[PDB]
Design a protein around this ligand. Sequence first.
Ligand SMILES: Cc1cc(=O)oc2cc(O[C@H]3O[C@H](CO)[C@@H](O)[C@H](O[C@H]4O[C@H](CO)[C@@H](O)[C@H](O)[C@@H]4O)[C@@H]3O)ccc12
Length: 349
Amino acid sequence: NNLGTELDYDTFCFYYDWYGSEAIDGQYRHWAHAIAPDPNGGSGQNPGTIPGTQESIASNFYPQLGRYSSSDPNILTKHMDMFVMARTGVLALTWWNEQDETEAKRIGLILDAADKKKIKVCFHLEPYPSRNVQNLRENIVKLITRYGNHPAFYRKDGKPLFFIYDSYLIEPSEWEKLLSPGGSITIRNTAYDALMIGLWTSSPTVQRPFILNAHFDGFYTYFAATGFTYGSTPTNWVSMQKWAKENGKIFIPSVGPGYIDTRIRPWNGSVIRTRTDGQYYDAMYRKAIEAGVSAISITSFNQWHEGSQIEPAVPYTSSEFTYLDYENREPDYYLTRTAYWVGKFRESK
Ligand SMILES: Cc1cc(=O)oc2cc(O[C@H]3O[C@H](CO)[C@@H](O)[C@H](O[C@H]4O[C@H](CO)[C@@H](O)[C@H](O)[C@@H]4O)[C@@H]3O)ccc12
């Protein structure tokens, strides 16, 4: 079929599975959240907490689905239908290395739900305690062994793909051991080989030799807030793509619809990026496409604390907070606008 509605499997949408309810988790996990002290506010701060009540959740927006559980199979079905609406073929699942049965259950539920809609799943490997290339190898082996035969497990030209958040916190001399074909614990040419996509943060002077010396297959930028880093400044994307092409690397710029995290970081207003009825998202997505990249990542499906979510949000005013909402747009606007941009992306692939 050639309907212009099909999923795109070079479009990766960052997905968070850390939400709970008192009932599916024993607590409205993540809907309740600590408020961060101001790093420039001095000692003795008592910033308090957001209790995750109906009235007061840890977001500047309010989900259409309410204070949902990421383990609720009925929520997961709805989320996969939202991915289908957005045409986002790959769910890039945040992975925290919790090593508990509830994590294992949730990952299985997500894979199963995704497969029903032909969605694929890859892992976004977060920075967990004592993360290093040896335990990262062991965890890559574990993920590929546990999930690699699941029909929803993502592969690109036969290889799994991992996004590695905060990769720059591990020295290239360590990465080389894992990612050079000659590295002492290499995954190259093994059953556990994968496309490893590192987080490009700062200037090319630093990031170019890092990516080469660490033997990453590519890089992404994550941040939805334009100008937060060099990498998340879209005017740099043409140049970053040129360098990627010259060096055989895969650039997967990250685009998002806005940013606001001031419920949890009241002092962080400088990072706010207003949605302007979709114009911010449009501008950022257009820059990614114009850069001529082969793949795009979306920050985020549902990072509600960041205010970067494309998941449907609704107007809500409670006794505790007046939430932002999608304004003149309907709750599903960012899903349907994602589908629009996926179509434009596919037209120039
Ligand atoms: C200021 C700011 C701007 C922006 O564009 O994006 C972010 C993102 C932040 O962190 C989110 O994304 C990370 C990558 O997936 C993830 O590691 C973060 O979660 C972890 O850190 C937070 C504290 O920042 C912690 O509460 C959570 O339990 C994790 O340990 C988060 O999802 C932060 C700031 C931004």
